[PDB]
Amino acid sequence: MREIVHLQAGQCGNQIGAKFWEVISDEHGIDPTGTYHGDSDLQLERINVYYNEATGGKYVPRAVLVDLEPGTMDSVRSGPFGQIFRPDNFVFGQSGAGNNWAKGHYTEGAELVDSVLDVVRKEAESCDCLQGFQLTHSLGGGTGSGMGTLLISKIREEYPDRIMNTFSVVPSPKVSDTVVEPYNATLSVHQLVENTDETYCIDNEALYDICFRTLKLTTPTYGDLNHLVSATMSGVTTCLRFPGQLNADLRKLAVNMVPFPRLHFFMPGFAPLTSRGSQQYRALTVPELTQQMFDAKNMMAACDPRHGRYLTVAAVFRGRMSMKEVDEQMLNVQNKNSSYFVEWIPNNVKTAVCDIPPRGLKMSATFIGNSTAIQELFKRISEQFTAMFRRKAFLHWYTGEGMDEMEFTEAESNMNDLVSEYQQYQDA
Amino acid sequence: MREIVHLQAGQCGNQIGAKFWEVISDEHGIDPTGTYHGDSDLQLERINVYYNEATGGKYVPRAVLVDLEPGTMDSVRSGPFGQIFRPDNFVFGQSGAGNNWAKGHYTEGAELVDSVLDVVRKEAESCDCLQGFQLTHSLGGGTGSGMGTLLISKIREEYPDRIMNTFSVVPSPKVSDTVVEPYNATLSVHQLVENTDETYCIDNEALYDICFRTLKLTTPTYGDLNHLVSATMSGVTTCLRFPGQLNADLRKLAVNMVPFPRLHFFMPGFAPLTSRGSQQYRALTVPELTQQMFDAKNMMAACDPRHGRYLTVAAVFRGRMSMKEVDEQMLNVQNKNSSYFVEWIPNNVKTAVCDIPPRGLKMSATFIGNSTAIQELFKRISEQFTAMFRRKAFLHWYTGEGMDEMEFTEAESNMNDLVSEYQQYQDATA
Amino acid sequence: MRECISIHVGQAGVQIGNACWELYCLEHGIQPDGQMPSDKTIGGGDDSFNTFFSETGAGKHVPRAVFVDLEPTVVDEVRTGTYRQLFHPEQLITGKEDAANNYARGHYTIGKEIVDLVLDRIRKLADLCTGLQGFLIFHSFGGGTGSGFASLLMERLSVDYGKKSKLEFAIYPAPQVSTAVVEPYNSILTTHTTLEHSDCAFMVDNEAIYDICRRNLDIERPTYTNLNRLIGQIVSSITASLRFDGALNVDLTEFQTNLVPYPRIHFPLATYAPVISAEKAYHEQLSVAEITNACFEPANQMVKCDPRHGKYMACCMLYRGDVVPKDVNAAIATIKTKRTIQFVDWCPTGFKVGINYQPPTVVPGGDLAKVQRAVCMLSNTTAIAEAWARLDHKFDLMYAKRAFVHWYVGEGMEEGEFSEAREDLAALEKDYEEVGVDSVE
Amino acid sequence: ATNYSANQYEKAYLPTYLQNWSPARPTKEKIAAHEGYTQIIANDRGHLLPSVPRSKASPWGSFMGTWQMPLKIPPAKVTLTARTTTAADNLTKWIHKNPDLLNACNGLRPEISGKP
Amino acid sequence: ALPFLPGNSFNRNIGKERFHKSQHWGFCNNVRMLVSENKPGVGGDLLYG
Amino acid sequence: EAIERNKDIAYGTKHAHYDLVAQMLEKEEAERAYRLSKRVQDFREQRQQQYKN
Amino acid sequence: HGLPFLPGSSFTDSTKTAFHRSQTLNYRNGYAVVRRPTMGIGGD
Ligand SMILES: Nc1nc2c(ncn2[C@@H]2O[C@H](COP(=O)(O)OP(=O)(O)OP(=O)(O)O)[C@@H](O)[C@H]2O)c(=O)[nH]1
Ligand SMILES: Nc1nc2c(ncn2[C@@H]2O[C@H](COP(=O)(O)OP(=O)(O)O)[C@@H](O)[C@H]2O)c(=O)[nH]1
Ligand SMILES: Nc1nc2c(ncn2[C@@H]2O[C@H](COP(=O)(O)OP(=O)(O)O)[C@@H](O)[C@H]2O)c(=O)[nH]1
Numbered sequence A: 001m002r003e004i005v006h007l008q009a010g011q012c013g014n015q016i017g018a019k020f021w022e023v024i025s026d027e028h029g030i031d032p033t034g035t036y037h038g039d040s041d042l043q044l045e046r047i048n049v050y051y052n053e054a055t056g057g058k059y060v061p062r063a064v065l066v067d068l069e070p071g072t073m074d075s076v077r078s079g080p081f082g083q084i085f086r087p088d089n090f091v092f093g094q095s096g097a098g099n100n101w102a103k104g105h106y107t108e109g110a111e112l113v114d115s116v117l118d119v120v121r122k123e124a125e126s127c128d129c130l131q132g133f134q135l136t137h138s139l140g141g142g143t144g145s146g147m148g149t150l151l152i153s154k155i156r157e158e159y160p161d162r163i164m165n166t167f168s169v170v171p172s173p174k175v176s177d178t179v180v181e182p183y184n185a186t187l188s189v190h191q192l193v194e195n196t197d198e199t200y201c202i203d204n205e206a207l208y209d210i211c212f213r214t215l216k217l218t219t220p221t222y223g224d225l226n227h228l229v230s231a232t233m234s235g236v237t238t239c240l241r242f243p244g245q246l247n248a249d250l251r252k253l254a255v256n257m258v259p260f261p262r263l264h265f266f267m268p269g270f271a272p273l274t275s276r277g278s279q280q281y282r283a284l285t286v287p288e289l290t291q292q293m294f295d296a297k298n299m300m301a302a303c304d305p306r307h308g309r310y311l312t313v314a315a316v317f318r319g320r321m322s323m324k325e326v327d328e329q330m331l332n333v334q335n336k337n338s339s340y341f342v343e344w345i346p347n348n349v350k351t352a353v354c355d356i357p358p359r360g361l362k363m364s365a366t367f368i369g370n371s372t373a374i375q376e377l378f379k380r381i382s383e384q385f386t387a388m389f390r391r392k393a394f395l396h397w398y399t400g401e402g403m404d405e406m407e408f409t410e411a412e413s414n415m416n417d418l419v420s421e422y423q424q425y426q427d428a
Numbered sequence B: 001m002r003e004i005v006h007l008q009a010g011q012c013g014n015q016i017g018a019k020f021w022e023v024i025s026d027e028h029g030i031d032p033t034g035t036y037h038g039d040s041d042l043q044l045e046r047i048n049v050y051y052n053e054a055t056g057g058k059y060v061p062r063a064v065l066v067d068l069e070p071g072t073m074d075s076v077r078s079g080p081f082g083q084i085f086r087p088d089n090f091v092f093g094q095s096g097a098g099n100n101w102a103k104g105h106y107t108e109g110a111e112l113v114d115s116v117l118d119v120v121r122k123e124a125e126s127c128d129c130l131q132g133f134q135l136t137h138s139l140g141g142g143t144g145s146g147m148g149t150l151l152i153s154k155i156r157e158e159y160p161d162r163i164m165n166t167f168s169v170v171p172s173p174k175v176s177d178t179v180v181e182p183y184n185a186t187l188s189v190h191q192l193v194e195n196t197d198e199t200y201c202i203d204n205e206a207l208y209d210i211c212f213r214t215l216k217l218t219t220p221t222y223g224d225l226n227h228l229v230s231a232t233m234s235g236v237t238t239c240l241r242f243p244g245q246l247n248a249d250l251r252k253l254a255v256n257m258v259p260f261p262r263l264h265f266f267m268p269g270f271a272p273l274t275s276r277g278s279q280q281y282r283a284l285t286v287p288e289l290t291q292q293m294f295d296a297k298n299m300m301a302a303c304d305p306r307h308g309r310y311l312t313v314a315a316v317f318r319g320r321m322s323m324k325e326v327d328e329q330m331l332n333v334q335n336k337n338s339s340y341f342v343e344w345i346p347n348n349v350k351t352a353v354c355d356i357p358p359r360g361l362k363m364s365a366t367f368i369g370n371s372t373a374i375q376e377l378f379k380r381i382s383e384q385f386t387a388m389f390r391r392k393a394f395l396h397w398y399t400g401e402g403m404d405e406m407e408f409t410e411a412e413s414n415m416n417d418l419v420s421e422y423q424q425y426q427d428a429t430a
Numbered sequence C: 001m002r003e004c005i006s007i008h009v010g011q012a013g014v015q016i017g018n019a020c021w022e023l024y025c026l027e028h029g030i031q032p033d034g035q036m037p038s039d040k041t042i043g044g045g046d047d048s049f050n051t052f053f054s055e056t057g058a059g060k061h062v063p064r065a066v067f068v069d070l071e072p073t074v075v076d077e078v079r080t081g082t083y084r085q086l087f088h089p090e091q092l093i094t095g096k097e098d099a100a101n102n103y104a105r106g107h108y109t110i111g112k113e114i115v116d117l118v119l120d121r122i123r124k125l126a127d128l129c130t131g132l133q134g135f136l137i138f139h140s141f142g143g144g145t146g147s148g149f150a151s152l153l154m155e156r157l158s159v160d161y162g163k164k165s166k167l168e169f170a171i172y173p174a175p176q177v178s179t180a181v182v183e184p185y186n187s188i189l190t191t192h193t194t195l196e197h198s199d200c201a202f203m204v205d206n207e208a209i210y211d212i213c214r215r216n217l218d219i220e221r222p223t224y225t226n227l228n229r230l231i232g233q234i235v236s237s238i239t240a241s242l243r244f245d246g247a248l249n250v251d252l253t254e255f256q257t258n259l260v261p262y263p264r265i266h267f268p269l270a271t272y273a274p275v276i277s278a279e280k281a282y283h284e285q286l287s288v289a290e291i292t293n294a295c296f297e298p299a300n301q302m303v304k305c306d307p308r309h310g311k312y313m314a315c316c317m318l319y320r321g322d323v324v325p326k327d328v329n330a331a332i333a334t335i336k337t338k339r340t341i342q343f344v345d346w347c348p349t350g351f352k353v354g355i356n357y358q359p360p361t362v363v364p365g366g367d368l369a370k371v372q373r374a375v376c377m378l379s380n381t382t383a384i385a386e387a388w389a390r391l392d393h394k395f396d397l398m399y400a401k402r403a404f405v406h407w408y409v410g411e412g413m414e415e416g417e418f419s420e421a422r423e424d425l426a427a428l429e430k431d432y433e434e435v436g437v438d439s440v441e
Numbered sequence D: 001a002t003n004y005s006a007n008q009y010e011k012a013y014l015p016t017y018l019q020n021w022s023p024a025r026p027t028k029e030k031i032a033a034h035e036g037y038t039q040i041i042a043n044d045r046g047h048l049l050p051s052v053p054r055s056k057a058s059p060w061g062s063f064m065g066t067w068q069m070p071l072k073i074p075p076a077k078v079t080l081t082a083r084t085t086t087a088a089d090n091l092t093k094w095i096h097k098n099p100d101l102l103n104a105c106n107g108l109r110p111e112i113s114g115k116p
Numbered sequence E: 001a002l003p004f005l006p007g008n009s010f011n012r013n014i015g016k017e018r019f020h021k022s023q024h025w026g027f028c029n030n031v032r033m034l035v036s037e038n039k040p041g042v043g044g045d046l047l048y049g
Numbered sequence F: 001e002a003i004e005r006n007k008d009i010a011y012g013t014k015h016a017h018y019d020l021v022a023q024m025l026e027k028e029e030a031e032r033a034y035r036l037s038k039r040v041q042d043f044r045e046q047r048q049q050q051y052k053n
Numbered sequence G: 001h002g003l004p005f006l007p008g009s010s011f012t013d014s015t016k017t018a019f020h021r022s023q024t025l026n027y028r029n030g031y032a033v034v035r036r037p038t039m040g041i042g043g044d
């Protein structure tokens, strides 16, 4: 019908996927055993987008959990919502890459590329009219950034027309936890530009920014961070699963967000974030929802859009509202902050309404936006990659894998020609 | 009516068919004593296909247990269904072959052939209209690969028109359990290529694979292997015994599977091989059945059909279903994978249904496929035989029995004739 | 499954193995006999020990180690000790006569006798093994066995296992105090032959640990046991991510890769924090900022080199306990914003952060207090080139007169290999200088 | 002798997946057929005929013990990323110094990656 | 306690010792013959009936 | 149609119950194997005490 | 006490110990075996 097969790669991928598969189970009212315990009829009306039917009133996620190290699976499989995954879909080898992008991509990722392509193929053909796959990984890893590209390059050949998302994670400059982070990210964005329909650049440091200042959580676990990201991936396909006054989908956003195929990097957003005591003094209304969103403090990216031009904007709203206000509020921001919006594209924003609110909450919204201020990230990563690469440092690890050295030069050049082309659209 | 005499040769033959007669006893509701205790009336309607009536309301399988050694027959009698066989069918001698094809075929089995022919012809006469016989043996031994073929060659001369099936066990490349294995294998397959209507190639290393992959058994003994083979043998003649919406027999499957008389080698598989982790997360529905049917991992041979072209494909179904899904899902595999099916045969798949499923199960099927990937077995045996036959290795055992050296030349030239003729059918233009 | 196999060589190797394995047994729950203090066999339970221990058919666990020493008594103490039934008897291998502070004897005459037996034992241990992460090899550069036989074991282990990690904990010679006269000869001839055959190296001197244990833990009179407790704690924090879950786990290959920029240089310096007594920790609040600031103090390194006399090129960092990623990031920011800590030009981000949940266990009779959080550090810095320079100075002024070379030449090693090894270290120091130079115009 | 291919099941017999954690035997992935039958190459008791060609090298394999091995074994892992030209040359020279270690069965075949 | 199908079978031989075999069958009076109807099975244990 | 869906639910329940029986039987089998190993070990302990003394 | 599952709405224990990771996924012979996950993180 319209089905999504959720990919997975690496320890970053497994911990976001564990939380993400937790939260949609709550919207659809699915208990840890797998059965259905919801009370509203429409909670089970389009579940087959993500779940697959099994006997006994049981549903299984359409996931492909992949990692070079089994150790991440064992932590996943012992969670509350860990036994809901079918065991055959787990794909895992014996040895990892050790934050080396080349080991993931060329030598060890080759042995696990046969089985993963089988697990998706069985799930790809199970669904009649598959809408498109979806992957989450980190660019600072060895498996998610590593072979995690080798799936993407392969399945584009098999299934070109289907839509590939990626809630990939981009390293942050101020705090980094991998020394060879520049080389993996430089060699992965070069994969991302050629083979991807749409990308969401989520940075963990901005998640630390949000939790510290807005929610003011004293002890933000990595579970809290994944909840921030899992809530985003629900809000992009909520129109797929539930009806609305003006409906949408993945392709409706992607078509209406990408003016030229080279630009598919978008800054997500999620509106109703308040502290424990802030909800006392708040007012659940649409102008406040749009006010809390466009503030740069709410973004989970590492770039302020006030420095660039908002190319295009998507806003998807959750909850039964009156769209006199949503059109008037969307025009108010468009006309006030005129300098930060591009000129050759009028009516830059796309809107959609999904009537069913998230569970326990009255109103919500999410946002996808393309800016020229993101290139403040690619430009920022490049010199970190370049300064390493003048001295040929950390290169014997990569060169010992059999790759030549011109891959670094071209991946630098694609990275530099992208920001050059991206820079031109700012000054147009 | 339509009867089958189940032949038997060697330790592999006796141990495989010991399980086989049990699983069809359970299908027909027969106790170890031999009496009828079933409840459905169709459980005894076509029982005469295999069983023979005895006085006092008892049934005797129409089997002929043959082996040059009396060894395994003690274990056969000491099994759970040990005394169901009538004792006069047990035919045996003094000294075995010792994995020597020559002794079984020429110097020792030639004394044991006459007695087996007496029992076989006695069973052959008793039935009115016998469809054919059925032999289970291994190609890596001395008796089933040896005199087991001499039974084949003699009986074909006596009864030309009857169908002869052979659920042979071929040796495996990766681990072998006999060092003169390619000597007996390359010289037994020459007997099959002249005198056999069908052969099913069952390889153990595939059987060891399937138990771990699709069932996740920590300790799969040879009993679990033998039950896995015996489920296939039931699945080909279930449509023969039990009524169906669209029926088939052995001969109906025979006509549609051999395009030319030289090609009678297949690779079978069994559909609802479901693991003890996966029953919880599963939906028993016919696309899931044909999904696991055509996955190459489910084959029980040492050849990958993804490397060759499927000539003809058989799907014999068990259980009550809806045939629209049966026709549609077969069509989906037909067209989504175009390059693995030959182009000069449109609609390379034959389908048949049997209304009654296997006992204790709802839905099932078995698959018979004639592929050009089976030629990867013959060349492998040819090289392993040639490299052993270059230096006259292990040969003094065989030529000391009186055989000349020249049969090895013609057995390998006929064998390499088959691989060349198989290859030309793979690379053929429509 | 996770796996590290231990190849302790020498007297230092055996005593370090004693401390490490006592800590592992107490941490996992294993008795000194080997069986759990229960039956606990109605099902397969917690198997986290599988990276160090091996199950048997009797419900016993056998360590994945091979103690080797070329003299009997150090291993006989193990064979008669408290843990005398923990170790399978064929694992602990001994020899009749030792090299006696002679790399030549430990490399050519006596070392080559017990090469085959130890290699066969290693082969059986690896045969038992499914997912082998690495070989942990601990020895000293001074002693004859721990230099010569350990070098030859590495050299043949390269042939036997092409790609497996061979991690190297080393007792580096102390700059002033010493237990030997002929130790610089073994020190120069060891690194020269392990330079292309070793993957990483965790060299520590006993002197700096003596200063640490005096200054912080208030033990005025330390002992090798008191030092071995700290070394066992270091190895524990290294392999904790393999043994237990974490917010961000880290294998061996990860911190091998994010620590060594160039093929010849592989010499990190380790650091543990905090190491304070119970009285000292009664009054002191401990947090991520305090522990990561103490990790950078020159008066806390267990090598006698001040990194302010150099520049870091990498830092692997391993948090353990009730640590929080937000405070980790705050601490990383506050250490990056300091000029007293330099970094090379080519490395803007030189950090590799791992996180583990389980706080470090305490062994009875120890010195440390029970602490909720801790941190380990492996810093690859260029401030160790002064140590190599001092070593070359001592070797040079010994070698001018051909002193003690009559011992070495007889056993089967020529004198030209001395000069070749000295020239190799001469090249290595200049390599360190080229790395330490900055390309700023 | 010859290790053939399990095709679909080759990953079940991959050398690391059989607990053999050393570099291992080659696995022949392809096979070829020969028309006709095979000539005799050897006499009785496996003596090669005078007319046939006969290969060189010892009929005892090639196994080198502790005392047979060279006293300076070069490593398998060679990564010529930042080395100078002469250093690269001399390490290649050390690698190629003893071909007997390369031809030995239990000897090493190194991997040499990159250019100075 | 399982329906008889592939996979649903467990070897009862775990725990059993003395896997002796009997001498059923044999040639007496130059005749192929099941010698003796009263011999035990594997383990020296009685058959059924 | 309601009868058909009840039929399918019945077949599914039978399938799941047979799974649960199979798993419990394996666990009991592993317990029996462990017991046999322990009996072998205790026999060995007795003979080992004899051999030492 | 059953507050809705919203972003940043969760509490964690401050006194649980052990944190033992058990080996569910494993290899046997040349195959991959996925053990049924009893005995969660830390034994409980
Ligand atoms: N840190 C630490 N160093 C030790 C220990 N035992 C010995 N050493 C050091 O090891 C060096 C000499 O090597 P040893 O381990 O004593 O003896 P060996 O390695 O067996 O060499 P041989 O005595 O010649 O057989 C000395 O300089 C000691 O400082 C120990 O338990 N802890
Ligand atoms: N956003 C987010 N990032 C994570 C999480 N877990 C790990 N990461 C990031 O993943 C990066 C390391 O990924 P890694 O484990 O090496 O990926 P792998 O090699 O593919 O398994 C680190 O920079 C972490 O910041 C998570 O739960 N959420
Ligand atoms: N599938 C299967 N194969 C078996 C069994 N028993 C033996 N074999 C095969 O039979 C071959 C040896 O057969 P053998 O006893 O020499 O047969 P015989 O010489 O005719 O008696 C081996 O390669 C085994 O793989 C069994 O129970 N099942």
Ligand SMILES: [Mg+2]
Pocket: C010, C011, C071, C098, C100, C143, C144, C145
């Ligand atoms: Mg000593």
